[PDB]
Each structure stands twice: as structure tokens, then as C-alpha cells.
């Protein structure tokens, strides 16, 4: 944690190797948001990509 924190708007399910699965209601740590459609977050044990649209930057 510590850095940018994000809110998961809807619970997402990974569809490919680079992605992660997240649940609506969770505040996770944001690792990378340079890409417009995919943002790297961190949940429980590992890091990975989920739709940038599924996340709200909590600044």
C-alpha cells in the first residue's frame, strides 16, 4: 500500500495471463496507470492488470 489507492467499482474476473481478479468494494494499491485502458494494481498476494475503467483513483 501507501502510494495511490484505488476503489474497485465492479468485481472483475481475469481473462488472460497478465490480469488479476478483483472485488467490488476493495481499496487496493495502484502500481501503474500510464496506460489508458489497463491499470496495474495489487491484490492479496500478486500484482497484475485490470481495466482502468473498473477503478476509481482515490486521491
Technique employed here was: X-ray
Give the phi and the psi of residue 22 in degrees, each rounded to 5.
-130, 160
From the CB of residue 22, how many other CB atoms can be counted at a distance below 10 Å? 24
What size, in residues, is the chain?
59
Neighbours of 55 (CB within 10 A): 20
Determine contact, residues 30/39, Cβ cutoff 8 Å.
yes
Q: What CATH topology corresponds to 1-59?
A: SH3 type barrels. (2.30.30)
Say whether 13 sits in a helix, a strand or coil: coil
Q: Residue with C-alpha cell 484505488?
A: 6
User: Which contiguous run of DSSP H or E holds residue 29?
Assistant: strand 27-32
DSSP state of 14: -
In 1-53, where does DSSP find H-type helix?
A: none
Hey, where are the domains in the chain? 1-59
- List of long-range contacts for 14-20, beta carbons under 8 Å, 24+ apart: 14/48, 14/50, 18/48, 18/49, 19/48, 19/49, 19/50, 20/46, 20/47, 20/48, 20/49, 20/50
Amino acid at each position: 500500500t501507501g502510494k495511490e489507492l484505488v476503489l474497485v467499482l465492479y468485481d472483475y474476473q481475469e481473462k488472460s495471463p497478465r490480469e488479476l481478479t478483483i472485488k467490488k468494494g476493495d481499496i487496493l494499491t495502484l502500481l501503474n496507470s500510464t496506460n489508458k485502458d489497463w491499470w496495474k494494481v495489487e491484490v492479496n498476494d500478486r500484482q497484475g492488470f485490470i481495466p482502468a475503467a473498473y477503478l476509481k483513483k482515490l486521491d
